[PDB]
Design a protein around this ligand. Structure first.
Ligand SMILES: Nc1ncnc2c1ncn2[C@@H]1O[C@H](COP(=O)(O)OP(=O)(O)O)[C@@H](O)[C@H]1O
Ligand SMILES: Nc1ncnc2c1ncn2[C@@H]1O[C@H](COP(=O)(O)OP(=O)(O)O)[C@@H](O)[C@H]1O
Ligand SMILES: Cc1cn([C@H]2C[C@H](O)[C@@H](COP(=O)(O)OP(=O)(O)O)O2)c(=O)[nH]c1=O
Ligand SMILES: Cc1cn([C@H]2C[C@H](O)[C@@H](COP(=O)(O)OP(=O)(O)O)O2)c(=O)[nH]c1=O
Ligand SMILES: [Ca+2]
Ligand SMILES: [Ca+2]
Ligand SMILES: [Mg+2]
Ligand SMILES: [Mg+2]
Ligand SMILES: [Mg+2]
Ligand SMILES: [Mg+2]
Ligand SMILES: [Mg+2]
Ligand SMILES: [Mg+2]
Lengths: 194, 195
């Protein structure tokens, strides 16, 4: 297996996760790629609620966890049982960084919810795509995506603290060009996977 | 003043909550009536998912709590700030009885989620409509609703244990006629509210 991509909006997660998916398929792995929230029919409904409705921060946390629970039970656990490489575009560190460090919700509580939703399933490696917020925001602005700079500075700092506190997290310099970032990822992956 | 109706499917909650809503409105209270899950636009979408999609028991728990959180923040807390009497058709005991006693999820974990979703808001009184499962099932059969006898027997017993452990839960014998059950509810309510 399980490879998680983490990092702020605009760090290149969706781009890199797709590159890694295609690369590992070509190398002969059986691989799955899922996004969080989403990745199942029910999860995609919850994703649309999360991205379109005005929600309070507590309802948001519970819906992220509900989407994760469905994806874990429906797809990830069955995939891992069949020795598929599962790549996730976001996972439990995003919930801690955004809902905990960003929104101020209790992190011990978030971690208990994460454990409940995941049944204790943990990544073999987490690739934290680290990038200065101003650089990320300029990438996003090009595609008419806007995120709050004050909020994301807290989240960025939170991810970096988590890379020291949580297990199996490798910090990737995501400021570089696409192929350069991918090479860094492949170097990090050689720590857990042929 | 927060008044919660609890009990198994077919115990008369929706019937009696509406009766109470009308009665208190006539007596000059400003009253709200909400159902769980549901009661908000988002909560109603979540209710539809809960009632129509195949879900694992953990995802179910989290959606029940998400609906509760939305209702608490959007409607319940603002209503209580305005001195409205808020009547709930189900609340936190339903989660402990169904997801805990029924499905076997950890009760302390469920209580922590309850506290999170509610911001610690507790009812002034909870009316547990207790009824034998057989009676409930026969009332539901008349309306083409079917529920699982084995499951509901565990849930009934769970509610009854909760009525002993949790604060301000009154057990109502709800197997009698509708008008008699309502009279018992009013007698119970007189302990906390001028009715
Ligand atoms: N290494 C890179 N350098 C510059 N732009 C990039 C790079 N990687 C991705 N992008 C572009 O930046 C934006 C954000 O990338 P995306 O993969 O959507 O990030 P995330 O999923 O982390 O928000 C997209 O427009 C994408 O094409
Ligand atoms: N006291 C009662 N005796 C007989 N039937 C009842 C009584 N109260 C309600 N009913 C009927 O039983 C069914 C279940 O009532 P309802 O209020 O929907 O229960 P709940 O909301 O607890 O499932 C409905 O068809 C309703 O009209
Ligand atoms: C998985 C997850 C995402 N999110 C947020 C991050 C994003 O702003 C939003 C949607 O996710 P996503 O589409 O991955 O954002 P992006 O491509 O911009 O990185 O959901 C949380 O707040 N908590 C979570 O647990
Ligand atoms: C509020 C709540 C309801 N439920 C279940 C009980 C019901 O079978 C279902 C829908 O609620 P509802 O329509 O109140 O059922 P009924 O009128 O038959 O009592 O949701 C839970 O499992 N957990 C919860 O926390
Ligand atoms: Ca650019
Ligand atoms: Ca460089
Ligand atoms: Mg993305
Ligand atoms: Mg906050
Ligand atoms: Mg965790
Ligand atoms: Mg009902
Ligand atoms: Mg179970
Ligand atoms: Mg509770």
């Amino acid at each position: 297996m399980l490879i998680a991509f983490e990092g702020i909006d605009g760090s290149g997660k969706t781009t890199q996760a797709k590159k890694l998916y295609e690369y590992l398929k070509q190398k002969g792995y059986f691989v799955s790629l899922y996004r969080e929230p989403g990745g199942t029919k029910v999860g995609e409904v919850l994703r649309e609620i999360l991205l379109t409705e005005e929600l309070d921060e507590r309802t948001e946390l519970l819906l992220f966890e509900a989407s994760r629970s469905k994806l874990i039970e429906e797809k990830i656990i069955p995939d891992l049982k069949r020795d598929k490489v599962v790549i996730l575009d976001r996972f439990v560190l995003s919930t801690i960084a955004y809902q905990g460090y960003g929104k101020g919700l209790d992190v011990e509580f978030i971690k208990n919810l994460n454990e409940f939703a995941t049944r204790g399933v943990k990544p073999d490696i987490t690739l934290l795509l680290d990038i200065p917020v101003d650089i990320a925001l300029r990438r996003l602005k090009e595609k008419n995506r806007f995120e709050n700079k004050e909020f994301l500075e807290k989240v960025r700092k939170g991810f970096l603290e988590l890379a020291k506190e949580e297990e199996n997290v490798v910090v990737i310099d995501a400021s570089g060009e696409e192929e350069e970032v991918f090479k860094e990822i492949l170097r990090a992956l050689s720590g857990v996977l042929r």
